[PDB]
Write a protein that binds this ligand. Structure first.
Ligand code: 7JT
Ligand code: ZN
Ligand code: ZN
Ligand code: ZN
Ligand code: ZN
Ligand code: ZN
Ligand code: ZN
Ligand code: ZN
Ligand code: ZN
Ligand code: ZN
Length: 203
């Protein structure tokens, strides 16, 4: 099975492990994981986080042929489980100094869900992309500006977290994957760049 390929100790996730638009697994509702986690589920989380780390590392991205990425969902590896990894880097200043925190968000999340959200909507100015989508897709992907999420870490510890800005967008994108929702589902059908008054456009 896909899971057995991915959890092999020497196996590194690359683009060849990522399923494509059209594959039915991308449209399922992913199954909840049970705690305590199986070895496979724990290893899979670690491999997904390692993928993100590698995708953001100039050397490893080049070695493995990777598109830079800030999130990954298990359904994108053909694994229909509620497991996502998020790695949102902070940026250096104008002087070249690294940020005080390397990341605004770094987590492998099990059974994540949005438990509440703002009335206000938000969208990235530049639209969104997807590891599983090899098409140019224009338009505002309209999401909640702010969310409160619950999820479990690999230990089974429950977390409750409020998110805004890019972090909120990233987590929503990945949670959609585990609900069988694609980013373009949330782009206006008639005018991709339609702006409903009050939309927060993130630069
Ligand atoms: O498809 C992806 C990769 C997208 C994530 C997001 C796109 C938009 C928000 C998150 C990616 N693009 C750049 N870095 O990662 N994750 O499911
Ligand atoms: Zn592989
Ligand atoms: Zn079930
Ligand atoms: Zn481990
Ligand atoms: Zn590495
Ligand atoms: Zn810190
Ligand atoms: Zn609601
Ligand atoms: Zn995606
Ligand atoms: Zn929602
Ligand atoms: Zn459409």
């Amino acid at each position: 099975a896909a899971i057995d390929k991915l959890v092999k100790a020497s196996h590194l996730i690359d683009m060849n492990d990522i399923i494509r638009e059209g594959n039915p697994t991308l449209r399922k509702v992913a199954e909840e994981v049970t705690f305590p986690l199986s070895e496979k589920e724990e290893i899979l989380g670690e491999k997904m986080m390692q993928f993100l780390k590698h995708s953001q590392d100039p050397i490893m991205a080049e070695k493995l042929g990777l598109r830079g990425g800030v999130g990954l969902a298990a359904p994108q590896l053909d694994i229909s489980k509620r497991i996502i990894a998020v790695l949102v880097p902070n940026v250096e200043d104008a002087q070249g100094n690294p940020p005080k925190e390397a990341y605004s968000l770094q987590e492998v999340m099990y059974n994540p869900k949005v438990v509440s959200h703002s009335v206000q909507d938000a969208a990235l100015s530049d639209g969104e992309g997807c590891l599983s989508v090899d098409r140019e897709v224009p338009g505002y992907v309209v999401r909640h500006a702010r969310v409160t999420i619950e999820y479990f870490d690999k230990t089974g510890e429950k977390h409750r977290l409020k998110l805004k800005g890019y972090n909120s967008i990233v987590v929503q994108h990945e949670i959609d994957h585990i609900d069988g929702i694609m980013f373009y589902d949330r782009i206006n059908e008639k005018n991709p760049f339609a702006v409903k008054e009050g939309l927060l456009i993130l630069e």
